[PDB]
Design a protein around this nucleic acid. Structure first.
Lengths: 302, 246, 173, 302
DNA sequence: AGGGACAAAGGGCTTTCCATTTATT
């Protein structure tokens, strides 16, 4: 053997979500889907920044955006679609033999666990992050191939076994192993209260007027699709000293917290992906980690 | 005898709007004539022309500043620096609802053409986006200019793109005549001699630069001849209108 | 300006009118065109870490070479062959394909894979023209990041950002 | 030792109030609710500045907003909801090494003293700030999880001891010491008199034709939600030479008086927070000051 | 037949250079 990696590898995104929408309904009548519009308010506060104690007697005027439920309704509705696309072993760039000897060494993995966790992240409502916190009772409705399901309450942190998720997981794992696609329409109902606050996605913008801006399609509040795609890829529980699931990254990096878990101890992607090619047998978990990175996709430079 | 297929209200989410280094907005016509060639390779239907509208379009971000997408670490040897954010390179995003119209010749039954289009729409991407919702296509037949009006008015809510031509250059024309450009072709500069990094290994390669033109967004029900609203390949690495300059 | 020309040629010192550093910073692909230089065509220049030298006024080589059409004046050879040979030995070709878009195009009975690169004249002429002629439908965007000293001298000298055309179509109410 | 704080730290809100609503009811009939709408009037008084004595003869004309009770009703009703969210030590931005070693130093604080005052500021009627002045009798009704409490007369400047506020404080402290949430529904009744003046929250406007613009929700007079939350956390009586309670703030500053009570004498939040991480022993009374700042939230980064 | 030498290719860490001119609806 003694074969080295090409300069650029490229794998597409096998899990395609769309940007969700926000609606205000009632827990009784879930048909009055009124949109939730983004306003603009101006608020007077104090500075109180670290240091600069000399300027601790003045006020700062700040303009922000906001999105609240109206006082007549008390239920948040979130609508989006999720598409699962198979053929996860075809390369886009830098195929050669490097991809074939990796495909023939990773054809005996556990797609059932990966599909079960990918569905269970949608089922538990991990795609909400501030909308889930404070809600009394959540209710998820999944429509896949004219077979409607409904869930009541799941535990977000621990992957608990149940017979409802296993059917959809077995449907997904047949697509991810062979060829084809499967689309599922997901609706989420949250009971919050009369006049509560909902939380859309915040922009990475440099506007000179607003201190905070929220994402909106034609005025109605929404979340980013690449934001929603992070919760599905939160399946990584196999890193060293594992406590909580993290997102699937090639270095296992959470830049929000400022630490990198998987990198630095010969456990990242670019060691295991060479060891699997060069004949070394892997454990059951780092065979799943590489395949989860392939389902995530991405380019990989030299 | 020419046939037409029309798809209405195609929701695309996450289109990278950087068409060139000086134009950020709608994707150009070359994307939509590449989409027809992609359909011709994947399905088998020979497509010679393509028209397109714009029901809704919105580039995300503020008015004069577009938003930046966050980046993740995707490179070999970036272990030491992985805890810190990332270097950031520019690419904007946009969200829109479009209407597409092809011009095919099929010479067969019409109840399998819709199925062949629908088997492709669920797979492909419109300029790197994600197709969320689309209406069922239908087949239209026109013979002369009197029967052509039917296929023109079929897609009523629309804003088609017609050619306008360049007078001297894009900057002075944009300032004087109030028009916004679109790349309609590429000019090649120098052949790449080492093809071990290309994605074909057999096709010859050339470094190229964009070449611009000026366009006009027009109501589809206020166009006299429909052939000025079509786009096709043909010229030296370039696209052009069938019915000439409007 | 020979004392600055030899200092720029003692460095890396490349001169181009078509590059790929305006798309991705990690590119290092430089193209100089012969058929496009004219009486007002402005070019760009790259050296490692954007290292330069002043001329007892605050001007580097890039600020001198674009003012009063000096680049054509050395290029046409009206300042002698003492500096024209040094100018012609400066602009060389530098070809790289990594981290760039590669698309196909339909030629006559076949395909052609091609790589779009950026234009150095268009960016500078666009920013310096639309401002004076009061065109207020643009996007102001700076490239280089926190340290713009890594792409081009034209990145470093004007930090205010280039102007890009807005191409947002109107929509149906 | 001597670990520095990370450059990005963030703490979310743990107290979520909603924007209040105003209604007009009679004192002996608590169900005939009608809206208090906002109108516009034009006033023609004189002008007087501490400059320009020459222009003391020209009556200026102003256009203001106003809201009053009708002449057949004499009781103002204020309605809002307050939500208390637990897990007050988990950081949003910023990981461990700092918040984890701050949690083990702020573990043994007295949550009962904080949770008593946070409910006593709602029960006494400090959440009104102009409708309290000139009222014959106030009456507050607090509803939590099918349990109703009524409060008639409570001193505001003094934190008195009674038997019914401590029944809610033991529920609030259980949420603030653990995980979960609890919801209070608060209704205030004040007997002002027929045709009296009610006071909504003003709005920050820039050069409007109106000299005074009031906040409104679909034409009904309301109060700002961040104005409601300022009255709840007015619990701070631990600064040097303490006379009256002020709001919880890292510099203890009020912008009306133009003075910072806590800043400038090595007593502020950032000096106290860095000392507690490095191993210094905090006083029993300013441990609740640092803990109240994490409930408020904000930015604490270099 | 196999540790040891002979020299390469990755990889962490440590510099390093380096400066505008803001209206737009």
């Amino acid at each position: 053997t003694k074969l080295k990696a090409p300069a650029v590898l490229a794998y597409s995104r096998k899990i395609n979500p769309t940007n969700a929408l926000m609606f205000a309904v009632n827990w009784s009548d879930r048909d009055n889907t009124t949109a939730v519009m983004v306003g603009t308010k101006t608020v007077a506060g104090t500075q109180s920044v670290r240091g600069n104690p000399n300027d601790a007697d003045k006020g700062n005027i700040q303009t922000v955006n906001f999105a609240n439920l109206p006082h007549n309704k008390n239920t948040l509705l979130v609508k989006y679609n999720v598409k699962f696309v198979g053929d996860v072993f075809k390369a886009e760039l830098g195929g050669g033999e490097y991809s074939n000897t990796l495909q023939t060494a990773l054809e005996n993995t556990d797609f059932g666990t990966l599909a079960y966790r990918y569905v269970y992240n949608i089922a538990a409502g991990r795609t909400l992050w501030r909308n889930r916190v404070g809600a009394e009772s959540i209710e998820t409705v999944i429509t896949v191939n004219d077979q409607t399901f409904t869930f009541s309450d799941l535990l977000v942190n621990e992957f608990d076994e149940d017979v409802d998720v296993a059917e959809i997981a077995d449907m997904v794992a047949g697509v991810l192993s062979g060829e084809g696609f499967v689309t599922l329409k997901v609706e989420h109902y949250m009971l919050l209260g009369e006049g509560s606050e909902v939380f859309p996605s915040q922009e990475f913008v440099e506007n000179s007027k607003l201190s905070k801006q929220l994402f909106d399609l034609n005025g109605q509040a929404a979340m980013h699709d690449q934001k929603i795609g992070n919760a599905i890829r939160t399946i990584d529980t196999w890193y060293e000293d594992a406590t909580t699931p993290i997102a699937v990254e090639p270095y296992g990096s959470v830049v929000r917290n400022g630490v990198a878990y998987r990198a630095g101890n010969k456990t990242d992607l670019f060691t295991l992906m060479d060891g699997a090619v060069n004949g070394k047998s892997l454990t059951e978990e780092d065979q799943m980690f590489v395949t989860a990175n392939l389902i995530r996709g991405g380019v990989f430079g030299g | 005898m020419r046939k037409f297929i029309i798809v209405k209200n195609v929701k695309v989410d996450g289109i990278n709007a950087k068409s060139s280094d000086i134009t950020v907005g709608m994707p150009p016509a070359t994307t939509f004539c590449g989409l027809g060639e992609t359909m011709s390779i994947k399905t088998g239907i020979v497509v010679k022309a393509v028209s397109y509208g714009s029901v809704k379009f919105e580039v995300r971000g503020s008015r004069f500043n577009t938003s930046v997408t966050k980046f993740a670490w995707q490179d070999r040897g970036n272990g030491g620096k992985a805890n810190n954010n990332s270097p950031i390179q520019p690419k904007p995003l946009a969200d829109g609802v479009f209407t597409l119209c092809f011009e095919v010749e099929w010479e067969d039954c019409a109840e399998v053409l819709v199925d062949k289009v629908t088997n492709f729409i669920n797979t492909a991407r419109i300029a790197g986006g994600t197709i969320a919702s689309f209406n069922k296509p239908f087949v239209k037949v026109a013979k002369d200019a009197e029967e052509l009006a039917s296929v023109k008015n079929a897609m009523m809510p629309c804003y088609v793109v017609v050619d306008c031509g360049v007078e001297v250059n894009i900057f002075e024309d944009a300032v004087n005549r109030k028009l916004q450009p679109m790349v309609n072709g590429y000019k090649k500069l120098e052949k790449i001699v080492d093809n071990k990094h290309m994605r074909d290994k057999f096709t010859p390669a050339y470094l190229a630069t964009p070449t611009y033109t000026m366009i006009g967004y027009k109501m589809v029900s206020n166009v006299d001849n429909f052939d000025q609203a079509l786009w096709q390949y043909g010229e030296n690495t370039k696209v052009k209108t069938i019915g000439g300059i409007y | 300006i020979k004392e600055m020309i030899e200092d720029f040629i003692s460095k890396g010192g490349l001169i181009f009118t078509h590059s790929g550093r305006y798309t991705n910073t990690n590119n290092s692909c430089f193209i100089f065109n012969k058929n496009d230089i004219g009486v007002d065509t402005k070019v760009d220049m790259y050296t490692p870490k954007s290292a330069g030298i002043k001329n007892e006024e605050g001007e580097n080589l890039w600020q001198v070479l674009n003012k009063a059409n000096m680049f054509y004046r050395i290029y046409s050879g009206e300042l002698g062959e003492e500096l024209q040979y040094l100018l012609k030995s400066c602009c060389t070709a530098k070809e790289d394909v990594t981290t760039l878009p590669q698309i196909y195009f339909k030629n006559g009975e076949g395909y052609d894979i091609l790589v779009p690169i950026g234009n150095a004249h268009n960016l500078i002429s666009g920013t310096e023209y639309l401002w004076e002629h009061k065109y207020y439908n643009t996007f102001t965007q700076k490239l280089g990041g926190s340290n713009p000293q890594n792409c081009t001298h034209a990145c470093n000298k004007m930090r205010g950002g280039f102007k890009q055309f807005n191409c947002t179509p109107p929509q149906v109410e």
